[PDB]
Amino acid sequence: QQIDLNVTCRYAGVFHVEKNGRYSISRTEAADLCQAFNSTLPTMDQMKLALSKGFETCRYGFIEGNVVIPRIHPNAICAANHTGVYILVTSNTSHYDTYCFNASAPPEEDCTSVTDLPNSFDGPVTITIVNRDGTRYSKKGEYRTHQEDI
């Protein structure tokens, strides 16, 4: 088994994780994935502070309670040109990326590489963390606690 996790810089501890290059994370997998990073699903307040420090993506992802895209610059193909924390209102479907919040991260922008998944558990999957600069870390383990996600 192989899982790739592409991660962004952290902004006030908040970062984005995309699994396997496609929208593929359920709400329960999202929480378990953040836990593997010693992190939690961000609150809206945490995500607003991250936005204010420079965080934006062009991908839907879970926070606690909603699915969002943080936007700084208006772009027609990202969140229908909105700025701010854009909240997904209407969708048929259930699988997105996720955001995670690590309280121990630096207070502003941190673009250093992520080099561990400190709270993954014993398991058979090769999990690879891929940073935007291409640097990679891999370990054998598991993070999904719900059978329905596996």
Query: Is residue 71 annotated as involved in ligand binding?
Result: no
Per-residue HEC secondary structure of the chain comes to CEEEEEECCEECCEEEEEECCCCCECHHHHHHHHHHCCCECCCHHHHHHHHHCCCCCCCCEECCCCEEEEECCCECCEHHHCCEEEECCCCCCCCEEEEEECCCCCCCEECCCCCCCCCCEEEEEEEEEEECCCCEEEEEEECCCCHHHC
Find where tokens 């600069």 sit. 133
Phi, psi of 106 (to 5 degrees): -60, 160
Query: Is residue 144 annotated as involved in ligand binding?
Result: no
HSE-CB for 126 with a 13 A CA cutoff? 6
Query: Is residue 27 annotated as involved in ligand binding?
Result: no
Query: Is residue 136 annotated as involved in ligand binding?
Result: no
Are the beta carbons of 14 and 101 closer than 8 angstroms?
yes
| Nearest-angstrom CA–CA distance, 44 and 65 | 8
- Residues composing the chain: 150
Find where tokens 């922008």 sit. 109
Q: Which two tokens stand for residue 86?
A: 């854009």
Q: Is 91 left (phi over 0), alpha (psi -120 to 50) or beta?
A: beta
Q: Residue 73: is it exposed, middle or buried by C-beta count within 10 angstroms (0-12/13-18/19+)?
A: exposed
| Nearest-angstrom CA–CA distance, 113 and 33 | 18
Q: Please tell me what resolution, in angstroms, this structure has.
A: 1.3
| Nearest-angstrom CA–CA distance, 19 and 108 | 25
| Nearest-angstrom CA–CA distance, 81 and 126 | 37
